Amino acid sequence: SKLIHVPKEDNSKEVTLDSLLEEGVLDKEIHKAITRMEFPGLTPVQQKTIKPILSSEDHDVIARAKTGTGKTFAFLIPIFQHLINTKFDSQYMVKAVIVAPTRDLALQIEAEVKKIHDMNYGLKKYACVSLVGGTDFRAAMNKMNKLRPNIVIATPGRLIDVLEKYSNKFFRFVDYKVLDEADRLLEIGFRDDLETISGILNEKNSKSADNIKTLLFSATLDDKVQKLANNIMNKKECLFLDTVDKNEPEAHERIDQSVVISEKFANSIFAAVEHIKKQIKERDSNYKAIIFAPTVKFTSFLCSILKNEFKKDLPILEFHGKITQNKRTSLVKRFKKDESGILVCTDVGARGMDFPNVHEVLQIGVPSELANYIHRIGRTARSGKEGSSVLFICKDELPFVRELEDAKNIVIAKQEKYEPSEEIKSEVLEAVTEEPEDISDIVISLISSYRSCIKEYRFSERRILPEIASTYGVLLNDPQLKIPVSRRFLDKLGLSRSPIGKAMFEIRD
DNA sequence: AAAAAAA
Numbered sequence: 001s002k003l004i005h006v007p008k009e010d011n012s013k014e015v016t017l018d019s020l021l022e023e024g025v026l027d028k029e030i031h032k033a034i035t036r037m038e039f040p041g042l043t044p045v046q047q048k049t050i051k052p053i054l055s056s057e058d059h060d061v062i063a064r065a066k067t068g069t070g071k072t073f074a075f076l077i078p079i080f081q082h083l084i085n086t087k088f089d090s091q092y093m094v095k096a097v098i099v100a101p102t103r104d105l106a107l108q109i110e111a112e113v114k115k116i117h118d119m120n121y122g123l124k125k126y127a128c129v130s131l132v133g134g135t136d137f138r139a140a141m142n143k144m145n146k147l148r149p150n151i152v153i154a155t156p157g158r159l160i161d162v163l164e165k166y167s168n169k170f171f172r173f174v175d176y177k178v179l180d181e182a183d184r185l186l187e188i189g190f191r192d193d194l195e196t197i198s199g200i201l202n203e204k205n206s207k208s209a210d211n212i213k214t215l216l217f218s219a220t221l222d223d224k225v226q227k228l229a230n231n232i233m234n235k236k237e238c239l240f241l242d243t244v245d246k247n248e249p250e251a252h253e254r255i256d257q258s259v260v261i262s263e264k265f266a267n268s269i270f271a272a273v274e275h276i277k278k279q280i281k282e283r284d285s286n287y288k289a290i291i292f293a294p295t296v297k298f299t300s301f302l303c304s305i306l307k308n309e310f311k312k313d314l315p316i317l318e319f320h321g322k323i324t325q326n327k328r329t330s331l332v333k334r335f336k337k338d339e340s341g342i343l344v345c346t347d348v349g350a351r352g353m354d355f356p357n358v359h360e361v362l363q364i365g366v367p368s369e370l371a372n373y374i375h376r377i378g379r380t381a382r383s384g385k386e387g388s389s390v391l392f393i394c395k396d397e398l399p400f401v402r403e404l405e406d407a408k409n410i411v412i413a414k415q416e417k418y419e420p421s422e423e424i425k426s427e428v429l430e431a432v433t434e435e436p437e438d439i440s441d442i443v444i445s446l447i448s449s450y451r452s453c454i455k456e457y458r459f460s461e462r463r464i465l466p467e468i469a470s471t472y473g474v475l476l477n478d479p480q481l482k483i484p485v486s487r488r489f490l491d492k493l494g495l496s497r498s499p500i501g502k503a504m505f506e507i508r509d
Numbered sequence: 510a511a512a513a514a515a516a
């Protein structure tokens with residue numbers, strides 16, 4: 001369809017709750033709720049989104065705004081407004097459906113809705129139910145029946161599982177569709193589900209198949225999403241709202257970025273520990289940080305080290321997809337509340353998760369996708385606070401830092417090399433209690449992980465994978481050693497006819 | 510065998 005740009009404007013008349021109230025856009029009850037949150041003033045994207053999202057019964061909406069700049073309320077407020085605008089029509093039906101790439105994010109958005117509810121008990125009538133995977137279906141549906149929610153937040157899969165069973169009962173009158181972190185939801189493995197959801201909701205709707213308004217939000221998107229969103233967009237023209245200049249980088253300016261480069265990938269483990277150690281001393285245990293890792297196993301493994309190396313000083317929270325949803329929710333709450341501590345996680349906590357007052361965002365290795373570099377370091381410097389970011393890598397990963405400059409215009413001015421002392425190496429290797437068999441899996445996971453993103457990050461397959469592989473030897477403290485595997489397994493890997501596979505592995509059946 | 514996400 002037709003895309004209409006609305007570029008960033010420096011000379012723009014401000015927008016406030018009071019103005020939007022006096023202008024008649026916002027009813028008193030939502031104003032009352034948002035004002036009590038005692039924000040200085042509406043963030044750019046909020047000022048730019050609210051009126052348009054409510055404005056025409058036509059145009060779809062895309063909105064780009066940097067991390068932690070209030071993109072949530074930027075659509076949660078208009079929704080509530082729309083709910084107030086139609087309180088006598090279909091008062092027991094879902095009118096707004098919000099979708100998010102992870103469960104914790106969905107639950108977080110739900111919690112935000114609950115905050116809105118908390119700031120004004122008059123808005124509790126507009127009930128809200130979350131539909132995410134890893135929780136009891138029956139209970140969720142019991143909640144659905146009980147409350148008759150006007151707002152649903154969900155993850156695609158469970159939402160499909162709900163729709164295929166109860167599309168007629170709750171979802172026959174949706175008017176708004178919200179894709180938070182829209183770009184991720186349009187990636188492979190998500191897009192089909194979103195297209196399915198879109199199809200079902202459009203098919204089921206009573207007024208028309210083009211009734212629903214679609215809202216796309218993310219810190220990272222371009223026009224190339226609209227080509228990917230074409231099948232889920234209904235309206236004839238799309239409203240692109242951008243709080244960022246076209247040339248300007250998507251990364252947040254207030255983030256103090258740096259990158260530590262090592263000879264080997266394993267070294268980055270030593271660099272991170274030495275860095276954290278320095279911070280705890282200089283900050284007197286007043287340290288709140290998030291550290292990212294490529295895989296679940298490397299996360300869990302890194303957690304062991306950090307626990308052995310820093311549990312005297314701080315709490316170490318392990319956070320990844322293989323954690324049960326209860327533990328995830330609880331630890332998320334704890335890290336949200338706690339003043340200090342270290343959150344060791346995969347990319348489950350890369351997008352959208354708002355942990356207040358995080359000092360530093362560390363990264364061992366590279367993200368699952370280029371864009372997720374922006375989101376990762378986005379976990380800090382949120383809501384007007386300052387923040388720092390450190391990227392721990394080795395030379396064989398440097399083509400990634402280059403691709404950060406080429407694609408996203410992101411330049412890390414602060415670079416420096418790193419080589420570990422024998423002391424720190426001894427200290428860390430002493431902190432490893434994992435058997436060789438486990439180390440094997442841990443490194444293999446990294447091999448598999450880094451293999452998948454070679455084409456994406458411009459890596460040299462012949463140079464990168466053996467480096468990742470030698471980690472095994474480094475951890476077992478025998479550099480010349482190779483990972484012991486069976487021929488059939490290496491054949492499953494498909495590297496049996498490769499010099500690399502021979503260079504990284506030792507067939508020991 | 511490799512974030513996440515449907516069991």
Ligand SMILES: Nc1ncnc2c1ncn2[C@@H]1O[C@H](COP(=O)(O)OP(=O)(O)O)[C@@H](O)[C@H]1O
Binds near residue numbers: 041042046066073382
């Ligand atoms: N208008 C505002 N002024 C100041 N802080 C805000 C405002 N709106 C939201 N926030 C804060 O921003 C934090 C995270 O914002 P979020 O909605 O996650 O932004 P994004 O989705 O763009 O990352 C929340 O803790 C919230 O309290």
Ligand code: BEF
Binds near residue numbers: 072180351352
């Ligand atoms: F809305 Be964002 F993903 F916090």
Ligand SMILES: [Mg+2]
Binds near residue numbers: 068
């Ligand atoms: Mg964000």
